[PDB]
Write a protein that binds this DNA or RNA. Structure first.
Lengths: 346, 346, 346, 346, 346
RNA sequence: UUUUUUUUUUUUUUUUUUUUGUCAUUC
RNA sequence: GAAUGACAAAAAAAAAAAAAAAAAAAA
């Protein structure tokens, strides 16, 4: 019920399943409620779904630390089992349909129905009875805070999305063990690097090399870590000397530049992906680039990736398995030294 | 609840208080429900209220024969008790607020509260206990199918509004006795003429004089009923010889002209009123008048009214009580004969 | 392309696959085009789909005689192969998704992909290569103007929907042979009665008995066709003596009553179905029923059905296979004669 | 008029009363004006009112220092006399109706009519003649910058809302003497505590103890002010060790935690009230609470309140009059020391 | 095509002119695209144009450094040749019509047609063949990064707009030479002062005098630069001692105040102009002025302007040519010293 | 004969936030 | 000596539009 959902929202902040109703009015793609005789906005529809459907999905969203939407997308997850994963980047549900949550978007009441068999259903091991449901599922992805009997685990990212904030949990456990089944057989998830999912204005280093990068000059940092010949002066630090922006394909370099000279980042595809494309215009020098593919790789991980390559190639598209998906980097070695190494996804 | 209201609508045609819910989607001021997997339109909001509130009011509307909205308006009825009167002319509720119907439009749960005391509350005597409520109400209007103990009745119109169509009921009683209370004292309603509330395209005579007017010519009908000197050739039949239309202030004349030559009726104020203003454009002779007051008085009643006037006055405003309200007619006479008789102020 | 679709609409009336572009503006859920410098309406979106998507689907609708949407719904058709069946009752596409029509609603480009296997895909045999496509489909429904080798035909209704109106075509063939496959095995479709799909205001009898019903009185028609004891005075002709309407469960009786005393039909579920529920309000006698199941069976078929039942049962639910689905009728009999006969659950 | 209102807005920033018109276009709940041939947005309607009505109410809003909307709500104010109080928290007018401001919302032209008698009209003493209007009002609330003859004054909050900015006026007087009348008799307003209406990101201490709280550590501040046994470690400072957040019921503690580690405050009821509920999620530790009642009491006032309680009770509901309304706190004590002190029912 | 434009947007962030289409859905004045099965927002329409037309214009906007919209407006530019100048202040195109950009807003395909002759067409000398077009244009404005043969150049502002970022180009050239033609004759543009177009929260001094103003106090800065008798204590620094704000007509003074005490700027006309009007409300002292003309002149330029005036006049209107337009400065003097230099019509 | 897959192979067009040349303009 | 604009040179990859060929596919 719409009124019961709004009552749960106004009394607890989300749908907790309590009983009760409140006066609700829907107008201009917005859900208003009457508090003390005056309308108070509860939810403004930013989705393509009907306003009531989107409101009820938003109320019933998962308020527990859930895997980042990019991780679920890279794993091929098509739907979630008896839960709603809310994509706060899009302000919309991460999946078009649901299983036993919303009557309008329901394709089944339980994940065991035949309709959900071809789909890769996301199972949350922290919910009772979901591990056994995943065991019987033809296609599914399982996350557990611990070990599962009989299946080899895959350790996921240290960070998880808790009500829209990507954090490494201390009071809560945000590191999950990932399992995948395709056509009834358990797949072995490949060894992967994981993007840190940090912000430009809230960037914090997570390693000693990151601290050195943020605190040292370009030449000192390059000489200290023997990073000569890998074009770190352009790939990470950036080249703000031409009308077209040069490099800046790591978020650490973007944060370092933003510390000294604020710029603008036009995100023309506002979604959650491993590689993000930005329309960056440097406010200090005027350097701009229409497409600047940015990956939130750990600086140690990026150093290892770029040092594991073969430098005697004119040009090569390099496949790196990052965030459980194969990211395509365009290696641009010349004369035995790297000229450009940028992600090409999205 | 919205879903319960839609369930009642799709299973019974109106809100009958049955339990159960159906999937509901609200989009573009319209309520849709999923029948066999495809969205089916249930209600398109033509009102100024929120779509869900208007849907709840429309579903909970009175489907029993109810007095016409114009009759309630002329009686000063401001709100209805435990019911919704739907104005089908406006496709909107006849009153802004309700009592014990819709949580967003309710000002009180019962008409006995102090908020409804100054308001003129419409009490329906066919509902159990509403007569007793009307007795204790400071201001109110009561309709009953029969007599009320200790209260003198006022016989209302023979016609009533049954689910949007005006009819003189045969299988169901559509004649009510009107009682009004202002400031706690039972008022004596005046002896009024009643409009027939007919339409042009299905006009049906209700009297012998009406039939004769429909079948007989102008001069024959005027001579037969001794209607010479009352300007019936213009007031009722209408004048189409000039660019500006003349007379045509009775719906009988409009219907007679429509029978031989249809014209266009632009109702620029689509509401329910005793005197209706139309933008009449004659498609045959090109005669048009921007505003034309048309009143649906019975032809016998109009003849009695026009014969009860004093003809020895150049200009006189005639106050005739019609549909429980005073309708002012502007009368022009010359040489002892009527020249012009139309509802004044147009 | 939206502009190419609108170009096809303005130059051919539907998407004919021509090349060209026109200036198109979308505003207030409506598609406008600029003709001679002034915006001209092309399409008003009455669906729940996005305006451009709905416009593209409407332009690519099937303009050939297609089976009525009720027939496809009763056959369990979930999607159409390389075509769009437009439901003119709802002014919306008959199916949520399409196969190789519109990229926004497409789930596959061809009906034989793995995604379309669980779905019952409607194959049109009049299109080259679709019979073989239906032969390879796990679930599908095939209609053909002629015979298909190795498959037993199922003669469908004489009527078909051509651009939104039901007609028995003479210049074009509207009778199709129906073949259904569920889980890869051809099913033998049951012997069924077919609704004639007629309108109230444009009712045209299709048999001698229907003509006699329309012209003869109630008693003469009942005595001529030995229809005593089957309560034809109530089920078909209808009773308007009480405030609650009785009967009117056959559209021919509604047509006969409308021929004399027009009434109002409020379709609170505006969709195509074998059994239609209306909110009937008799404008002459005041009789009204909130819900009334009306089925448009041929009077010969209804007579055969009512004569094939056993009269010596107090209460019995009668199952009739109509329009390829089982319609459940309520049968009440007393003293070896019929009392009421209406579709059950109304 | 709408055009005159827009002229006043574009020439003076608010409706002053000047004569003149500017070209105006209304589209998508927004009012645009044509400045030098290009449309300029004047007002985006965030209310449930019509766009033009909301625009005219916003233009005619009070730009003088007005009482905070929560103060008016706690006093029972239902309408304002010849002025509009704009609620900047909701971006909507604080009251549904107005008195002599907007013709679409007006229930009266002057507050002396019968319709305004039951309502608690807000009279502003800084406008000439409003003191005498309040003296003759059945129900009303009066604010004055000075003393009123024959009336005992109640000193209000030091801060007041000035064009949506809460400030303690230095060049203007933001302290008003509050008077109240119900049924024609003056009440003596209770002696209440007043919330400071401070922001999280712009928190500024208003006393020495708040400075000590923000500067010194938890243990030092607790020991210095003899605050042992009142659970200040969790009640104000808060506990971030478990998955569910504990405490943070004083906005000063939220400000102190924000100063060291920013977190998200999801205000699911964006209105103005003495007690605010937030969906608190700690970005550093992962602690989160769905509903966290936060009140912006002066730290001196909160210390006095917590020291005025009787500690020898297991469970006790505390009635505290804050902002002219009774705020309920739930008190748990064990072994003669406080365990928690939070607003009741959250 | 809408789909091709959206494909270009999702691939490069702006319309580059490539071939390809993506699934696009338009709903609620917003353009969505389907990326990985979920709709992703691409553009939300804040203009008065249709959503598809506005999206096409936004994609085809100029991404190179272009003159500020205020400069073009003051030069009387009515339309741009084969380009779109996006006004990021209004989030709408700076000109109503276009030349060979979008079919819906196009008045001509080339600027040489007769329709574009009366309009002052903006020509970009950086684009090949536009200087020749400007030579043959009856009315036009041309900007070039260098000299033009046979034409005397007018050096423009040092700053220009790059993707909505106003910057002095270092990697790019943001200084242009302005040429204007009206009725086929080349005018000599006047010698003008230029507004710096700086932000309040991102104010950066561009001269030694501005640095001194920001660092020193009022008295020291006035003494060092010999600014006694010019009322710099009010015009620039501003007066907050009264309820009505005094002076503060230079953005440098607003920035200096914002450094120590942030306040509110209600820009009730959100457009780009040389003289901006703000509804300034001082949060610290409560001094507010409904309308306040703030001009972003260089402090040295303003000092020269105020020292070039004739002080021996009681009241005088001062004409200063700023940004190629005549700004009316209202000067008040008493006893041979400046009293107030507020910009006219605040 | 139809179909999806496993795809491979051939050609056309488009593209890639690499370097490099020619023409063009402007210092 | 540079910048910009219009293009080409190198290397790899992607997208489709045309096919052929195949292991499968059901006919």
């Amino acid at each position: 019920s719409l009124e019961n959902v709004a009552f749960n929202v106004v009394n607890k902040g989300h749908f907790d399943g309590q009983q009760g109703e409140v006066p609700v009015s829907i107008i201009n793609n917005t859900v208003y409620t009457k508090v003390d005789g005056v309308d108070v906005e509860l939810f403004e529809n930013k989705t393509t779904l009907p306003v009531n459907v989107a409101f009820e999905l938003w109320a019933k969203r998962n308020i527990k630390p859930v895997p980042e939407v990019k991780i679920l997308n890279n794993l091929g997850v098509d739907i979630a089992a008896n839960t709603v994963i809310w994509d706060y980047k899009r302000d919309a549900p991460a999946h078009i349909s649901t299983i036993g949550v919303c009557s309008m978007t329901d394709i089944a009441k339980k994940p065991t129905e035949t309709i959900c068999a071809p789909l890769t259903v996301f199972f949350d091991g922290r919910v009772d009875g979901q591990v056994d449901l995943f065991r019987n599922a033809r296609n599914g992805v399982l996350i557990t805070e611990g070990s599962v009997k009989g299946l080899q685990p895959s350790v996921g990212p240290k960070q998880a999305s808790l009500n829209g904030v990507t954090l490494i949990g201390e009071a809560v456990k945000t590191q999950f063990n990932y399992y995948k089944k395709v056509d009834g057989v358990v797949q072995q998830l490949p060894e992967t690097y994981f993007t840190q999912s940090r912000n430009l204005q809230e960037f914090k280093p997570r390693s000693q090399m990151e601290i050195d990068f943020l605190e040292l000059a370009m030449d000192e940092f390059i000489e200290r870590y023997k990073l000569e010949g890998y074009a770190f002066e352009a790939i990470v630090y950036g080249d703000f000397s031409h009308s077209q922006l040069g490099g800046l394909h790591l978020l650490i370099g973007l944060a370092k530049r933003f510390k000294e000279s604020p710029f603008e980042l036009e995100d023309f595809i506002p979604m959650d992906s491993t590689v993000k494309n930005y329309f960056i215009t440097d406010a200090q020098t005027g350097s701009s680039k229409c497409v600047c593919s940015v990956i939130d790789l750990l600086l140690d991980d990026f150093v290892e990736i770029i040092k594991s390559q073969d430098l005697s190639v004119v040009s090569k598209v390099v496949k790196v398995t990052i965030d459980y998906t194969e990211i395509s980097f365009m290696l641009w070695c010349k004369d035995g030294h790297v000229e450009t190494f940028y992600p090409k996804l999205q």
